[PDB]
């Protein structure tokens, strides 16, 4: 006795007559990325997660990247893997640009919002 | 509808003389020679030139040079054939030796009544005739010479349909193996063109798009 699947069964679109002409998983990392992508997606069966769960700024950034990469010393230090990056400027510009997003991530994980504001 | 059955052929000349090298290619030529010397392992000539000279110095304290000199003078004996029979002539479009480092294409002026067009070499085919047989008949008929060329398949390369009675023009692609091109100064207007002069010779849309299936390299 068999029952038909409720939703769409995985590994169904790629099953054809000739898989020899199809290009290939030559490695392991690609399968890990795609399998993590599929494990992130919701499904119809029972899963572990079920029970256990503008233009001016871009132009300026492009100009800064072109000016920084045009320096001979920066490229010479990069090819000799001896270049370093000042942490203070990066920390300050993190406090400027995308600091609220990461602070929201900490306020989400550290159990703050469900206890303060429901 | 009456279809004016027309076929043609795109003749190709393989490069007997290789293309000249970029100076950047010369830089990797020198660099690859340097790294091949650096990663080699005691060839016999240097063993017969360094250690033999060290032993001669030891004998004097108590020939590779002649070989290099005779190699140099024998290199100076046989003069190399010139790769450029192209700039000295500069007007021998009918000759097969117009260019050596590029492909050469047969291309014939044709006198019509309502038109007067510099065309890729064409012919008229019958339904009983094979299209490959039509191309072979074109090669054996139009130039009135003795080439021996080689095709690849019966698959075509480019079709163009122009009307004024429907009509169509079939574009294959051949390849010259060799040829006895007797009486090179023919009364016809065959001109060998690498890539560029086609755009100087073939203006309309049915003829300025020939180069998209011609091997530019």
């Amino acid at each position: 006795r068999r029952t038909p699947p409720l939703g769409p069964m995985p590994n169904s679109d790629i099953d054809l007559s000739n898989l020899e002409r199809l290009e290939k998983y030559r490695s392991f990392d690609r399968y890990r990325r795609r399998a993590e992508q599929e494990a992130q997606a919701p499904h119809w069966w029972r899963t572990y997660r079920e029970y256990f769960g503008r233009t001016q700024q871009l132009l300026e950034r492009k100009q800064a990247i072109q000016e920084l990469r045009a320096n001979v010393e920066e490229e010479r230090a990069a090819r000799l893997r001896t270049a370093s990056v000042p942490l203070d400027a990066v920390r300050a510009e993190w406090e400027r640009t995308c600091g609220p997003y990461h602070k929201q991530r900490l306020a989400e994980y550290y159990g703050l919002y469900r206890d303060l504001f429901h | 509808s009456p279809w004016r059955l027309l076929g043609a052929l795109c003749l190709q000349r393989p490069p007997v003389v290789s293309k000249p090298l970029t100076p950047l290619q010369e830089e990797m030529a020198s660099l690859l020679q340097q790294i091949e010397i650096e990663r080699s392992l005691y060839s016999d000539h240097e063993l017969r030139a360094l250690d033999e000279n060290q032993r001669l110095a030891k004998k004097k304290a108590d020939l590779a040079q002649d070989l290099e000199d005779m190699w140099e003078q024998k290199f100076l004996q046989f003069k190399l054939g010139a790769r450029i029979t192209e700039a000295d002539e500069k007007n021998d479009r009918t000759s097969l030796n117009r260019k050596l480092d590029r492909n050469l294409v047969l291309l014939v002026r044709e006198k019509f009544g309502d038109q007067d067009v510099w065309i890729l070499p064409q012919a008229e085919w019958q339904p009983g005739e094979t299209l490959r047989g039509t191309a072979e008949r074109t090669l054996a008929t139009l130039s009135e010479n003795n080439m021996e060329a080689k095709f690849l398949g019966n698959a075509p390369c480019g079709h163009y349909t122009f009307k004024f009675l429907g009509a169509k023009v079939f574009f294959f692609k051949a390849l010259l193996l060799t040829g006895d091109f007797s009486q090179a100064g023919n009364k016809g207007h065959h001109v060998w063109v690498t890539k560029d002069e086609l755009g100087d010779y073939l203006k309309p849309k049915y003829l300025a798009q020939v180069r998209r299936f011609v091997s530019d390299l």
Binding site: R76, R79 | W3, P14, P15, V16, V17, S18, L24, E27, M28, L31, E38, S40, L41, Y42, E46, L47, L50, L80, G81, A82, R83, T85, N97, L100, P127, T130, L131, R132, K150, F151, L152, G153, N154, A155, P156, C157, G158, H159, T161, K168, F170, F171, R212, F213, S215, D216
Partner: protein, 99 residues
């Protein structure tokens, strides 16, 4: 017969002492890195022109095939038919000085 000439000669063992020295300068290896950069760019461009020419002439030939299908119902069977004279097909490579 499984005999192959990839076996290294026995003479390349003993006297490996001619060039133990491998020393360059910083400017030389900077030029090496820049040359590798620009040649990766250059031959990537070369393969880009190669793939552009092949995609152009593939689309030209498939347009050619569909036009020959739509204008000749009895010629496509012999146009896709292959030629048996390609079995002894050879071509010598290019040279420098013509005879």
């Amino acid at each position: 017969i499984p005999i192959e000439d990839f076996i290294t000669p026995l003479k390349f063992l003993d006297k490996a002492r001619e060039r133990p020295q491998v020393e360059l300068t910083f400017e030389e290896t900077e030029r090496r890195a820049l040359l590798l950069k620009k040649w990766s760019l250059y031959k990537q461009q070369e393969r880009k022109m190669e793939r552009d020419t092949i995609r152009a002439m593939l689309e030209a030939q498939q347009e050619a095939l569909e036009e020959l299908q739509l204008e000749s119902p009895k010629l496509h069977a012999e146009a896709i038919k292959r030629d048996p004279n390609l079995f002894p097909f050879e071509k010598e490579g290019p040279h420098y000085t013509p005879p």
